[PDB]
Amino acid sequence: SFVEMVDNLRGKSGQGYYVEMTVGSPPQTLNILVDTGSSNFAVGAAPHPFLHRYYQRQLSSTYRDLRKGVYVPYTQGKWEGELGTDLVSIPHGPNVTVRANIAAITESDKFFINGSNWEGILGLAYAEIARPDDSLEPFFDSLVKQTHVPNLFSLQLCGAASVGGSMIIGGIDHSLYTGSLWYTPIRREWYYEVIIVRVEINGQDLKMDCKEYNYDKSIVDSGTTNLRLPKKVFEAAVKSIKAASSTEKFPDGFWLGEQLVCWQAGTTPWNIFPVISLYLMGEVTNQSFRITILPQQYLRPVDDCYKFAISQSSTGTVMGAVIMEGFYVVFDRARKRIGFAVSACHVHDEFRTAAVEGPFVTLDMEDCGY
């Protein structure tokens, strides 16, 4: 059923995960970025120094022009283009063809990455955050409307240059995870917004007002590399991580992700870096669950060299690839919930392991929403 979709994701570290798609008639093959942090489907449609290939509207009999412009700004990079529609397929996905909105990228700034091997982006979030407005139906909505594909998809992102993973469209693949799935409500259908109710570092509560954790918002974004935290939360976390690792001293700019830390190969002191536990709101009253991430996740490999992959945000908490790696993440749009489970490619060391645990009791969870 879903075995055809296992391992359909490829990528380079820090440069996102992409799936193979085809657009137009006859089909044009492109590598498309998988992004739960946006809602626009767009592809390079003009020559660019970093593009191996691009979408040629002229060669598609099925292309239709919508005669409207569009731009999308991301935390990293931005592009503008022309709106249109065409037939789209996913070779290593469901056996269907849909007519979907496509943005033909004609100009861009720091969007395409030299050597990334992808030429477009697939925004998997909801219409509310689509550009220019919410009348531009996102791809997955079109897929569900035009076909019998269930309103659900799941992402298994695996870590270590080259990375891989699975995007299971229309269901859940049980051979890809162990233990139970734990679900947190989608608070509002715009980004995939959730609510963090508690934070622990090495078993110690950060003891901040839980509103700070979701200050503005908290989202699940496969398009973002880092765990991005609101300033106050970032400072609290960094202070604690500095304290646990204090046995060693690191250039101050390491903590800002500006310069690397290097250790002799096989000598990396993982044990001085703490585990981080994020408690998410559960499905029943006063009930949370926690996901625990290891330093191997937020110390992204770049002698063995690493970059601190926890950074500041002015748009709320962004749970990026460092969080999603090692877990099987289910985007259950039909039941307005996001599931977490330990992935089959989960990260662990000799004494510590990434985990999804519950149930936990957490009082006044509704107070944590901004």
Ligand X SMILES: CCCC[C@H](NC[C@@H]1Cc2cccc(c2)CCCCc2cc(cc(N(CCC)S(C)(=O)=O)c2)C(=O)N1)C(=O)NCC(C)C
- Contact positions toward ligand X, by CB under 6 A? 14-16, 33, 35, 37-38, 72-77, 111, 129, 221, 223-226, 228, 311, 315, 318, 320
d(CA 50, CA 161): 18
Judged by beta carbon, residue 76 or residue 286, the one nearer ligand X is 76
Structure tokens at 100: 């979907």
- The vertex-27 CA angle with 30 and 60, nearest 5°, equals 105
Asked if 23 contacts 62 with a C-beta cutoff of 8 angstroms, the reply is no
Q: How far is the CB of 219 from ligand X (least distance, A)?
A: 6
Judged by beta carbon, residue 31 or residue 311, the one nearer ligand X is 311
Q: How far is the CB of 17 from ligand X (least distance, A)?
A: 9
Eight-class DSSP state of 290: E
Structure tokens at 5: 């979709």
Q: How far is the CB of 85 from ligand X (least distance, A)?
A: 20
- Coil, strand or helix at 360: strand
Asked if 120 contacts 33 with a C-beta cutoff of 8 angstroms, the reply is yes
Judged by beta carbon, residue 8 or residue 224, the one nearer ligand X is 224
Pairing of strands 162-169, 78-89: unpaired
* Residue with tokens 């529609």, as numbered in its chain: 85
Active-site amino acid positions: 35, 221
- The vertex-293 CA angle with 327 and 254, nearest 5°, equals 125
With 0-12 / 13-18 / 19 or more C-beta atoms within 10 angstroms meaning exposed / middle / buried, residue 283 is middle
Q: How far is the CB of 75 from ligand X (least distance, A)?
A: 3
Q: How far is the CB of 307 from ligand X (least distance, A)?
A: 9
Q: How many residues are there in the chain?
A: 370
Judged by beta carbon, residue 224 or residue 362, the one nearer ligand X is 224
Judged by beta carbon, residue 27 or residue 77, the one nearer ligand X is 77
Strand partners, 319: 220, 227
Judged by beta carbon, residue 129 or residue 199, the one nearer ligand X is 129
Judged by beta carbon, residue 40 or residue 288, the one nearer ligand X is 40
DSSP string, 245-281: HTTS---TTTTTTSS-EEE-TT---GGGSPPEEEEEE
- Coil, strand or helix at 126: coil
d(CA 12, CA 305): 16
* Residue with tokens 């400072």, as numbered in its chain: 235
d(CA 68, CA 80): 11
For residue 359, is the peptide bond before it cis, meaning its omega torsion is within 30 degrees of 0?
yes
Q: How far is the CB of 312 from ligand X (least distance, A)?
A: 8
Judged by beta carbon, residue 280 or residue 323, the one nearer ligand X is 323
Strand segments, DSSP code E, in 27-176 are 28-35, 41-44, 64-73, 78-89, 97-109, 120-123, 153-158, 162-169
